[PDB]
């Protein structure tokens, strides 16, 4: 398993900034674990972005977790063929320079009650740093 | 939150632990990230360890504070460690790193 | 709402006729089962 | 509404020429067993006119 991030390393102000994570050796699809980013600020601690999961129940399509403060200016996508996952953040600012690590979410993914727990990050990526 | 000390360094051969305070759940892990590198899983599922991680490592947990131990420091060792718990319905919430220094 | 919750069990092998001829295997859903049923009627003693 | 919240798995084993029996995979999700649904309010007037008539 190897996540390889690939996408622009220098985006100007106000614009999109879109990041782009490929998985090798396990499938997107898979239910076992969720899959979102992690990023760490050049020093500072380790801040949950978001994840989600297409393993859905009867009533959704999918599964998604958001931040709650990053949540409107924030896209997650999966793509299950070709184990790929996007990243969409709107409007960045100079406090969202980071190095941006792709992760791979372990918990009560495989048997949960009531919602799913992604919980621990098993496997991590290389990670990218995103200037603003 | 969570909440860790700025460092705890120690010298090699020494049994060393450190603690997480702020842990509402059993969704505790662990974290080892070298200096400008990746990090790695090395504790989940509170006290679980991934195949391949070295058994010194231990996670044992009081009221609302976890633990990890480790005995036989190496100067290998030295790297970030990060703490992670579920919160709320579906947050999750990471400390704010100590710096392992051999 | 506060619709009353019923727990229900289910069975793949049934015999409401195995002695007139044969039981059935009702074979493995795959998925998450869900129908919407209008009750209509009730049955007592 | 009723509902088995498992979300089962099926197994295809051939077990000769041309049979093929349907086992149950391993459970995806929940340990929840399955239920059904019934609005209190309606079906207390509905137990109302029951015991009327
Ligand atoms: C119970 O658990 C099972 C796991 O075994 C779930 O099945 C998975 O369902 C998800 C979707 O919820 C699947 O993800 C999809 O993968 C497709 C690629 O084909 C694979 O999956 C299909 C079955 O879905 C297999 O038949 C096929 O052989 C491949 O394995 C994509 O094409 C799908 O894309 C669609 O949905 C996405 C959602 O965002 C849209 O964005 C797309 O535009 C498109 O509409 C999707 O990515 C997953 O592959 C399934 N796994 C398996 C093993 O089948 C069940 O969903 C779950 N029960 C319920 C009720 O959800
Ligand atoms: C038969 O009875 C069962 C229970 O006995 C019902 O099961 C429940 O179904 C509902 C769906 O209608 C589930 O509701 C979900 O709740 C999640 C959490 O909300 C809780 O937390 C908030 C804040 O703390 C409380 O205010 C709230 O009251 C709850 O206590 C929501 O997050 C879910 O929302 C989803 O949709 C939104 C928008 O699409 C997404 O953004 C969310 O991320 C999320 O995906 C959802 O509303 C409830 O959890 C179920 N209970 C159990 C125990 O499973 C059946 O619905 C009912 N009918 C049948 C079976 O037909
Ligand atoms: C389970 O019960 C629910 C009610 O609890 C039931 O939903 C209702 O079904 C009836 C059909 O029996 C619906 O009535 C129809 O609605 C359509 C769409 O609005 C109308 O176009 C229909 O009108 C035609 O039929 C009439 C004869 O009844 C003609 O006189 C008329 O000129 C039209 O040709 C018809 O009224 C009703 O709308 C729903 N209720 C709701 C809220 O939608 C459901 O059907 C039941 N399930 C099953 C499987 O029977
Ligand atoms: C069994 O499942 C049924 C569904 O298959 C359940 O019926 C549904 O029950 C919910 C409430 O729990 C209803 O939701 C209501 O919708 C109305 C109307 O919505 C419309 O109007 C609003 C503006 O008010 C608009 O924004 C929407 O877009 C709609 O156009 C709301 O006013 C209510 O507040 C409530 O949200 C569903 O409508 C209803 N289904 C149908 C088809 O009507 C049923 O309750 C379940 N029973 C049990 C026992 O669980
Ligand atoms: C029901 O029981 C069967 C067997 O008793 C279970 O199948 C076993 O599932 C485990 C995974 O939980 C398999 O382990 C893995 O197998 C792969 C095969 O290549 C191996 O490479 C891995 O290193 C790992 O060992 C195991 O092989 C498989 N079969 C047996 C004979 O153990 C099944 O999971 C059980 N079902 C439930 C719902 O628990």
Redesign the interface.
Same mark, same amino acid.
């Given at each position: 398993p190897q996540l390889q991030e690939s996408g622009p390393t220098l985006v100007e102000a106000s614009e999109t900034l879109s990041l782009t994570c490929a998985v090798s050796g396990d499938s997107t699809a898979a239910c076992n674990s969720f899959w979102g980013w992690v990023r760490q600020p050049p020093g500072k601690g380790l801040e949950w972005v978001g994840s989600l999961s297409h393993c859905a129940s009867y009533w959704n399509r999918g599964w998604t977790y958001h931040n709650p403060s990053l949540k409107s200016r924030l896209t997650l996508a999966l793509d299950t063929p070709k184990n790929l996952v996007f990243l969409k953040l709107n409007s960045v600012t100079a406090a969202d320079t980071a190095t941006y690590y792709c992760a791979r979410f372990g918990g009560e993914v495989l048997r949960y009650t009531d919602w799913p727990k992604p919980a621990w990050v098993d496997l991590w990526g290389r990670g990218t740093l995103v200037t603003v | 939150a969570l909440t860790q000390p700025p460092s705890a360094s120690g010298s090699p051969g020494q049994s060393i632990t450190i603690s997480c305070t702020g842990t509402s759940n059993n $969704?505790v /892990?662990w974290?080892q990230q070298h200096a400008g590198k990746? @990090?790695?899983?090395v504790?989940? =599922?509170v006290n679980k360890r @991934?195949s391949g991680v070295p058994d010194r490592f231990s996670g044992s947990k009081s009221g609302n504070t976890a633990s990890l131990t480790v005995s036989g420091l190496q100067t290998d060792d030295e790297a970030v460690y990060?703490c992670? /718990?579920?919160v709320g319905?579906? =947050?999750?919430? $990471?400390? &704010? &790193?100590t710096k392992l220094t051999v | 709402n506060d619709s009353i919750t019923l727990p229900c069990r289910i069975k793949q092998i049934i015999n409401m006729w195995q002695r007139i001829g044969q039981a059935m295997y009702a074979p493995p859903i795959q998925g998450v089962i869900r129908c919407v049923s209008n009750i209509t009627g009730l049955i007592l003693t | 509404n009723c509902t088995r919240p498992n979300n089962n798995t099926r197994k295809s084993i051939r077990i000769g020429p041309g049979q093929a029996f349907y086992a149950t995979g391993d459970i995806i999700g929940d340990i929840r067993q399955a239920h059904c649904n019934v609005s209190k309010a309606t079906w207390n007037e509905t137990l109302g006119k029951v015991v009327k008539q």
């Amino acid at each position: 398993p190897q996540l390889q991030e690939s996408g622009p390393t220098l985006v100007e102000a106000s614009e999109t900034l879109s990041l782009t994570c490929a998985v090798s050796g396990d499938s997107t699809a898979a239910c076992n674990s969720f899959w979102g980013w992690v990023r760490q600020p050049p020093g500072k601690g380790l801040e949950w972005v978001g994840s989600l999961s297409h393993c859905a129940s009867y009533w959704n399509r999918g599964w998604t977790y958001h931040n709650p403060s990053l949540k409107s200016r924030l896209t997650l996508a999966l793509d299950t063929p070709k184990n790929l996952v996007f990243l969409k953040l709107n409007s960045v600012t100079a406090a969202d320079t980071a190095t941006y690590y792709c992760a791979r979410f372990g918990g009560e993914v495989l048997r949960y009650t009531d919602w799913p727990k992604p919980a621990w990050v098993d496997l991590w990526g290389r990670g990218t740093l995103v200037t603003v | 939150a969570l909440t860790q000390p700025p460092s705890a360094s120690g010298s090699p051969g020494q049994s060393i632990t450190i603690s997480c305070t702020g842990t509402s759940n059993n $969704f505790v /892990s662990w974290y080892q990230q070298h200096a400008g590198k990746a @990090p790695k899983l090395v504790i989940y =599922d509170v006290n679980k360890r @991934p195949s391949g991680v070295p058994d010194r490592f231990s996670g044992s947990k009081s009221g609302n504070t976890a633990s990890l131990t480790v005995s036989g420091l190496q100067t290998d060792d030295e790297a970030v460690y990060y703490c992670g /718990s579920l919160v709320g319905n579906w =947050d999750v919430i $990471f400390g &704010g &790193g100590t710096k392992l220094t051999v | 709402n506060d619709s009353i919750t019923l727990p229900c069990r289910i069975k793949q092998i049934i015999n409401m006729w195995q002695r007139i001829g044969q039981a059935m295997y009702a074979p493995p859903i795959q998925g998450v089962i869900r129908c919407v049923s209008n009750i209509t009627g009730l049955i007592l003693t | 509404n009723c509902t088995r919240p498992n979300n089962n798995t099926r197994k295809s084993i051939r077990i000769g020429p041309g049979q093929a029996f349907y086992a149950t995979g391993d459970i995806i999700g929940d340990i929840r067993q399955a239920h059904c649904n019934v609005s209190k309010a309606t079906w207390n007037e509905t137990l109302g006119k029951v015991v009327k008539q």
